[PDB]
Amino acid sequence: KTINIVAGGPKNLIPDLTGYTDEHTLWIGVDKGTVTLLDAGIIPVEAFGDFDSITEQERRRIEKAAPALHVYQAEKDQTDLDLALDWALEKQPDIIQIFGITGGRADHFLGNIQLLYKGVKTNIKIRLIDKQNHIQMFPPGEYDIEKDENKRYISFIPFSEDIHELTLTGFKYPLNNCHITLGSTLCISNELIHSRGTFSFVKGILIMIRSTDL
Numbered sequence: 001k002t003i004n005i006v007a008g009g010p011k012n013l014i015p016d017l018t019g020y021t022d023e024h025t026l027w028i029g030v031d032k033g034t035v036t037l038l039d040a041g042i043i044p045v046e047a048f049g050d051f052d053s054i055t056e057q058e059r060r061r062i063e064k065a066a067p068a069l070h071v072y073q074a075e076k077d078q079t080d081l082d083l084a085l086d087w088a089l090e091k092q093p094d095i096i097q098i099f100g101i102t103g104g105r106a107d108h109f110l111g112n113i114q115l116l117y118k119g120v121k122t123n124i125k126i127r128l129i130d131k132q133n134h135i136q137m138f139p140p141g142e143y144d145i146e147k148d149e150n151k152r153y154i155s156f157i158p159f160s161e162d163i164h165e166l167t168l169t170g171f172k173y174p175l176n177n178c179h180i181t182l183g184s185t186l187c188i189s190n191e192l193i194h195s196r197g198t199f200s201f202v203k204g205i206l207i208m209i210r211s212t213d214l
């Protein structure tokens with residue numbers, strides 16, 4: 001099953017959620033995010049955070065449209081989003097997808113990025129999504145990707161430590177059992193030259209950004 005979380009970032013950086021709706025995909029709203037869900041026509045099963053960020057009318061509008069909507073509050077020491085993720089990881093879905101993850105405040109995004117770290121610990125696919133990016137972290141292993149018709153760039157960035165024996169295949173910029181040192185931006189702006197591409201490394205935490213220039 002799939003769980004989709006919509007955090008409270010600005011709506012303009014968020015994709016069409018509609019096309020992400022499916023019979024095996026539950027939704028949950030976080031902060032303004034639950035408001036975003038209602039506008040799109042999706043009702044959250046649960047909602048996390050408080051209302052000090054949502055408007056008077058906005059609250060009424062939610063209540064009218066979702067009376068039995070339960071809202072779990074945070075403890076100021078854990079982000080609303082951060083809290084929603086525990087609820088979702090617990091459910092153990094094959095995939096968690098988060099939206100409203102980018103915005104004006106950089107801290108916001110930088111945070112969400114750390115959230116992905118909690119996902120490798122639980123070996124559960126956690127993909128972050130916005131209008132032009134798909135972020136995902138991977139532990140050592142061997143992974144396949146398909147060419148993306150709308151986003152042509154695929155970047156790789158080391159996380160906790162150095163990346164060991166990184167191999168890229170089906171990419172414009174190949175790599176064979178390469179050692180990527182922490183902080184390196186060599187593996188940014190790559191592309192797929194085939195229909196399927198493969199990448200793999202033996203040690204470290206790798207980040208993968210698939211993007212577009214619009």
Ligand SMILES: Cc1ncc(C[n+]2csc(CCO)c2C)c(N)n1
Pocket residue numbers: 173174175185186187188189190
């Ligand atoms: C493994 C690997 N991946 C991507 C690039 C290409 N690249 C690196 S930096 C950048 C943007 C600035 O030119 C681009 C396109 C490479 N050389 N090696």
Ligand SMILES: [Mg+2]
Pocket residue numbers: 011012014015016
């Ligand atoms: Mg929208």
Ligand SMILES: [Mg+2]
Pocket residue numbers: 050052
């Ligand atoms: Mg708050």
